[PDB]
């Protein structure tokens, strides 16, 4: 399913992930299209920072959902 | 006081006692 | 374990991965001089209670707290 990652600069990134993908996997995919190390980035959704352990299904990320990227 | 507010920048649910986003330091009111 | 505390200045603290909130406010008082009874630590949008520990709120390495 295609999701979105709205950076903190207005830019919106389109990712293709499965509901069974962990956050570490998502951050890995973001690195491929931005070159940003997973350890330099944090993901916020529904008003909560995503743990690198859980998956998308755990945080209940559906199709066409949009995460926000906040560099650290 | 107040209630937990969502940082307009990344939707992060911050604490009322704070005036800036805990994740991006973006102010609460603008 | 090393952590941070946003007062506008910032202080670096060396504590244990499971140190209680009470033990932290004790160190902050030694470095800043602020009485524990007059300091509130905020993290993840939720205020830390002196009854719990750091491991509870998942205070990882180089985490950043806030004094209010
Ligand atoms: Zn934010």
CATH of A1-72, one of 3.90.950.20, 3.10.20.90, 3.40.50.300, 3.30.360.10: 3.10.20.90
Whole-angstrom CA distances from C58 to A71, B11, C52, C63 are 20, 21, 11, 9
Q: How many interface pairs between A and B have CB atoms less than 8 angstroms apart? A: 30
Answer whether B22 sits within 8 Å of C68, measured CB to CB.
no
Using an 8 Å CB-CB cutoff, list chain B residues near A70: 9-10, 12, 23-24
Pairing of strands C41-43, C64-67: antiparallel
Q: Is C41 left (phi over 0), alpha (psi -120 to 50) or beta?
A: beta
Q: A40-61 in b/e burial notation, b at 16+ Cβ within 10 A? A: ebbbbbebebbeeeebbeebeb
Domain regions of chain C by residue span: 1-68
What is the distance in angstroms between the Cα of B9 and the nearest Cα belonging to chain C? Answer: 15
What are the tokens at B2? 């107040």
Comparing alpha-carbon positions, the chain C residue that sits nearest to B17 is C68
Bridge partners (DSSP) listed for residue A29 = none
Q: If one looks up domain C1-68 in CATH, what number appears?
A: 3.10.20.90
Type and span of the H or E element at A26: helix A23-32
């Amino acid at each position: 399913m295609q999701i979105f990652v709205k950076t903190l600069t207005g830019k919106t990134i389109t990712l293709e992930v499965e509901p069974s993908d962990t956050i570490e996997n998502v951050k890995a995919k973001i690195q491929d299209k931005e070159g940003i190390p997973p350890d330099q980035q944090r993901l916020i959704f529904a008003g909560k920072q995503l743990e690198d352990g859980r998956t998308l299904s755990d945080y209940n990320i559906q199709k066409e959902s949009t995460l926000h990227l906040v560099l650290r | 006081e107040g209630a937990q507010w969502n940082c307009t920048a990344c939707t992060f649910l911050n604490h009322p006692a704070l005036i800036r986003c805990e994740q991006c330091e973006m102010p609460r009111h603008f």
